[PDB]
Each structure stands twice: as structure tokens, then as C-alpha cells.
Amino acid sequence: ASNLKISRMDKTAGSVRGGDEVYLLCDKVQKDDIEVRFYEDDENGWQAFGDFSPTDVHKQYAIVFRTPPYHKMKIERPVTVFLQLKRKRGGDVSDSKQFTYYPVVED
């Protein structure tokens, strides 16, 4: 039925260690049936998930979650990946958007 779409996004970049809180506005989703997936469509096939409880799904139109860490921690340059809303029931998705992982700066 209803098509998944990501309207806007709090921030679109974070550390490679992930865990950065992101506020995402979207079209009608269902607190339990929905999930946020990060991946890179290359050969590798990496994929991760946004951390959030059914509680962080605000009145069916928004999701507050935390970015999952990137599969490679020692990157040198800003790696860009895609993310998309996906249902658990159908497997359906939304036209994915992008997200950039900045190299864990020194200290």
C-alpha cells in the first residue's frame, strides 16, 4: 500500500564509530514493522541498521535513531553510503538517501 519516502533528515554525516543521533521525517510508517538500513550497493554487500525502539517512531511520521558504525573503522577519506526505510513484513523500501562517515579524527 503506502509507499515509503524519506522527507527530511536532521543531519547527514557522522563519525565512523556511528551512534550519532539522527532525526528523520518520513511518510506514514508503523512503529514495529519499520527499520532503517545503511548499505553500499557495491560487490561487498555491507549493511547495518539504525538503532531505535518503537518509542522513537513519532506518531508514524518520524524516526529518531542512532547511526550504526561503518564496517571499516580506519578509513582515511569521507566514505559515503546509502540508507533506506524498509519494512520487515514486505521487504519494501524507499528511494534511499545518502550519509557520510567522517574518519575518526585523531586525539
Binding site: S7, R8, D10, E21, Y23, L25, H58, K59, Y61, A62, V64
Partner: protein, 101 residues
Amino acid sequence: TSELRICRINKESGPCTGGEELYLLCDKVQKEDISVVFSTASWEGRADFSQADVHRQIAIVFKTPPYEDLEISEPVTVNVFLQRLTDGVCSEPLPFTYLPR
């Protein structure tokens, strides 16, 4: 007659200069009768956003109004709340603090 309430705000601090972008989740509101207000007991600034920035009545993306004293030394936490325009009724407030510079 209708509920007015903020459920959360993507940030809690920010520069007194204002103009910073924030996201806030709230209970159903009317894009054509709503406003975000930052305030103290002496001051009161209204946040800047378009009716287009009110996502499905349950969220608003706006810009923090600049603080009265743009030359603060210490941080200043203020109140942030929703206010209707038809009857000026406000919702409970949430803590946001301004920073020096």
C-alpha cells in the same frame, strides 16, 4: 480544547547569535496556527520557520531566534514552547540554552 505539547528537540544548546536549525517533535498541530517561542522572564523571541517546515502536524524544522544580549559571557538557558496564534495558548516548556560568542 486541543493538546499542545513538545515531545523532544534535536539539540539543547546553541550560540546566542541565533539562526541555528533545529528539529522538534510535537503532538498534532496546525501548520497555519502554530509558532515556536524562546523566552525568559524579561525577553521573548519567536523562532523562524515556514508552514512548509511543519511535517505532518507532528514536527517542525525551524531556526533559533537570536538572543536579546548577543554579547553574553556566561551561557543562558531559556524556555522553548509552542504557541497557537488563534488564542495564544502555550504548551509546557522545554530547556534550551544559549552560548557565548
